[PDB]
Swiss-Prot record, chains A, B:
Subunit structure of this chain's protein: Homodimer. Interacts with NHERF1. Interacts with GAPDH. Interacts with S100A8 and S100A9 to form the iNOS-S100A8/9 transnitrosylase complex. Interacts with SPSB1, SPSB2 and SPSB4. Interacts with ELOC and CUL5 in the presence of SPSB1 or SPSB2 or SPSB4. Forms a complex with ASL, ASS1 and HSP90AA1; the complex regulates cell-autonomous L-arginine synthesis and citrulline recycling while channeling extracellular L-arginine to nitric oxide synthesis pathway.
Protein name, entry field: Nitric oxide synthase, inducible
Function of the protein: Produces nitric oxide (NO) which is a messenger molecule with diverse functions throughout the body. In macrophages, NO mediates tumoricidal and bactericidal actions. Also has nitrosylase activity and mediates cysteine S-nitrosylation of cytoplasmic target proteins such PTGS2/COX2. As component of the iNOS-S100A8/9 transnitrosylase complex involved in the selective inflammatory stimulus-dependent S-nitrosylation of GAPDH implicated in regulation of the GAIT complex activity and probably multiple targets including ANXA5, EZR, MSN and VIM.
Binding site for Zn(2+): C28, C33
Annotated binding of L-arginine, by residue: Q181, W290, Y291, E295
Subcellular compartments: Cytoplasm, Cytosol
Amino acid sequence: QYVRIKNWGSGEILHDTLHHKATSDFTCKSKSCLGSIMNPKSLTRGPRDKPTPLEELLPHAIEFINQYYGSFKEAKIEEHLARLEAVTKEIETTGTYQLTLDELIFATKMAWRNAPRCIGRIQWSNLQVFDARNCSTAQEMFQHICRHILYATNNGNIRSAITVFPQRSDGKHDFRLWNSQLIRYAGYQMPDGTIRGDAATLEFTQLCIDLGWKPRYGRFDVLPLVLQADGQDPEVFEIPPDLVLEVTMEHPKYEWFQELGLKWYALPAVANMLLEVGGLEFPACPFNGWYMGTEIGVRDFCDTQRYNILEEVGRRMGLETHTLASLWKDRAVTEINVAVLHSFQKQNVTIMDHHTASESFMKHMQNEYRARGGCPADWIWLVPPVSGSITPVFHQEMLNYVLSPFYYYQIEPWKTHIWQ
Amino acid sequence: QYVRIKNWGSGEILHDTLHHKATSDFTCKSKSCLGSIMNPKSLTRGPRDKPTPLEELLPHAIEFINQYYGSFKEAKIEEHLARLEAVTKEIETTGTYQLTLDELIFATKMAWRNAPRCIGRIQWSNLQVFDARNCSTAQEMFQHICRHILYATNNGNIRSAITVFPQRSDGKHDFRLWNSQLIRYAGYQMPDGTIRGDAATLEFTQLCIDLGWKPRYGRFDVLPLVLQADGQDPEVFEIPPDLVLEVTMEHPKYEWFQELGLKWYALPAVANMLLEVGGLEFPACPFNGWYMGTEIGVRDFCDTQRYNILEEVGRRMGLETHTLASLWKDRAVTEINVAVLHSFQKQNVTIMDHHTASESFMKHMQNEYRARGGCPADWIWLVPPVSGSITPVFHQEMLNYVLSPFYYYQIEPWKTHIWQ
Ligand code: HEM
Ligand code: HEM
Ligand SMILES: C[C@H](O)[C@H](O)[C@H]1CNc2nc(N)[nH]c(=O)c2N1
Ligand SMILES: C[C@H](O)[C@H](O)[C@H]1CNc2nc(N)[nH]c(=O)c2N1
Ligand SMILES: NC1=N[C@H](c2cccs2)Nc2cccc(F)c21
Ligand SMILES: NC1=N[C@H](c2cccs2)Nc2cccc(F)c21
Ligand SMILES: NC1=N[C@H](c2cccs2)Nc2cccc(F)c21
Ligand SMILES: NC1=N[C@H](c2cccs2)Nc2cccc(F)c21
Ligand SMILES: [Zn+2]
């Protein structure tokens, strides 16, 4: 009937009726393009109540095993046949099947390598894999999670890593991290109508209160890990301050910039995505890279829906703040980016300027089309929030499609959960 | 088999094979998105050899007439029936049919209003329409074209206008403007391996030489109008210097900025697009708006494939030009934008800063979803080449689809032309 459209700024909504009068055919769909949609169902993989039908779990299983053994130079044919063999057996013996650690490792880099929205895929090979497939309880998740955070933070010399938890069996014994990301600040909707901390989190920050968390009502409070294991209920876990490393924001000129008091954690880790490989699916598997300047400087510090600091950084800059055409916004935002850039470098925290990141992507793309002729790429995501055209990737045409293995999104845990 | 991908920067090409292993379904197409493609066939409308099949030319004809009469408050029912009547008759009397001037006027604003890539659609109502449907020869095109340029330039107070030429009959009597745009500089691939003027034009600039134009080998030479009428051959016409208004580039601080000697015409007019309305199609119909700062400042002055001036504007700024991470590119580009902005304002030439343009679009979108529930919008095009996230439209989800009436692209004239 109609498509819903969200404006993540005003968070307003709209119902598109008009698109029905869509003439004939478009560039990919029968007249209609939803590439501008944030979370399309096409990239999600939701809940379940029963296991995974053998007539599928098996075809996909075989496919992966081929991709796998058909990888390393000089194939181990007997093993390729051998595995396929044991695989089938195991499948037709318990329904699902288990992966060999070398497979997981393969799966994860491939999946990562297949993330159309990632721009640092040139590193797809150097990835740490933590096998937690035999985890049992919430307390054990929380333990591996700490292990992870500690490993990737490496005191500023960030390291990409992923810690794979228990795969999905039937669908009622899922392991899920309820948070959006490993480390993330909390946002309270304080009295005076204002909002402190991270306007983004708001909702989640509440659930943490409802599940019993102590809101230290501040501007940079690292939210608690809300872990649910085996399909049980989520148990709240606060993170060891000692583990969350942060950079303090200071400009290389304007000395009044530290007066703003801003800071930000140095570890970007996606917590709620889902890995799909060989017709198997792990609903819990956090992975992390490292920041790219403008993420913090332009998205987190300068968004109507986040910390929102653009104007004030301008006022303390002179700029005719009340006259759009003056380009004060353009000037301000740029210095803020020098700040975040300056700061991490000073305090020694692996970070990357958007200009060198784009160049690095292009390289990777080359090797990737040369390597396997193709490279999934969502333009809307790979081009920086600022200075787009001044970058290589902006002028680069690209095709976006889901392959496999692959990393998917998934319905918010609290929405679909049996609170026994 | 495979899809071609172009990188409009290096102009390099690639063949995407991989997309075939596309899992299942995507956000719009059966796993595959080409929204990042510049000129997809979906938005083009090409050549013909025979008239337009009555079983179509008629259904579409009726559809438009309904949209039309179903527009103005308090319908002229008898006329709505009356027209539909005369329309049918005329159609079943000569094949195609003619539009009433009020229809063209309607058609054009609707078409414009339906341009998913236009960001100034909030002006869709104030548009000047010039009826040239009875033009006959090249010399007559060249005349209306001058008329047009003169009208829209209005000595700096730019005015949106469109001059509709002879519709399409069979397909061998097409009227086409061969240039990409009314006013555009020429690019010569000079001796020393360098390139002067506009690297973009290059190819076309040659054809103008081959059709007998005198290359004044400079940095800002307005190309000649290459007009072909009735399906004949293109005749070259130089433009009256007196008509092409230009702004001289000068910074409000760095006084050495005029030393660069840069300038740019104040009239943006698309020349080669095709209007489709009521199953009719006019292959020649130039329309114009007015510039939006960053078009000149970021796309034309700062592109590996255009004038390319970013570095030098930085060197004369101090900036550590050889260290990407220094953000000199970000700083430089911004001042250049102050320049182009400063300059037009000074010299009194209707221009618009990208920040107020986005705000203005959002408004329009609101009225548009409220008006007819929907608004075709190509995100990739509506979000500025710089300071994207600092704008409203970046966070706005949107649907892109072709409606009608509508403005289409079309195969380069010289590619498909009988040179008798
Ligand atoms: C080593 C350095 C890395 C860098 C600089 C990098 C950078 C980025 C950036 C800037 C984004 C966009 C985030 C946003 O728009 O909010 C992104 C997204 C993504 N990256 Fe990477 N990445 C790296 C490593 C990894 C690794 C190791 C994986 C997986 C194992 C990965 C998986 C993805 C996925 C799935 C997304 C999409 C996330 C989403 O849609 O929310 N990245 N990355
Ligand atoms: C009055 C002020 C106007 C402004 C500020 C405006 C601005 C723009 C801008 C910035 C673009 C992007 C160009 C590019 O990316 O190279 C664009 C595209 C477009 N506009 Fe508008 N526009 C205006 C009026 C009009 C009018 C009067 C029409 C038609 C009658 C129109 C039709 C379109 C079309 C078809 C495109 C797509 C052109 C293409 O794909 O190459 N615009 N406009
Ligand atoms: C590959 C890519 O689609 C291409 O560079 C596009 C991106 N968006 C654009 N948007 C606008 N307005 N104008 C352009 O020329 C382009 N180029
Ligand atoms: C509507 C729109 O799709 C949305 O704002 C997108 C655009 N591109 C993005 N690109 C990245 N990397 N990150 C984002 O959060 C967004 N937001
Ligand atoms: N840099 C990144 N941006 C977002 C995050 C921001 C904050 C936490 S995760 N997502 C990513 C996912 C994986 C690796 C990364 F490096 C990133
Ligand atoms: N109101 C404000 N808008 C800008 C914005 C930054 C990001 C989005 S809007 N900056 C500010 C900074 C400090 C205090 C403020 F009140 C503002
Ligand atoms: N501003 C514009 N940008 C491009 C052009 C750039 C140069 C000539 S046309 N296309 C448009 C088409 C119509 C009206 C406009 F305003 C524009
Ligand atoms: N080589 C150059 N690169 C930048 C670019 C501008 C736009 C794209 S690259 N600017 C320059 C300006 C002057 C002379 C130059 F040689 C350059
Ligand atoms: Zn699409």
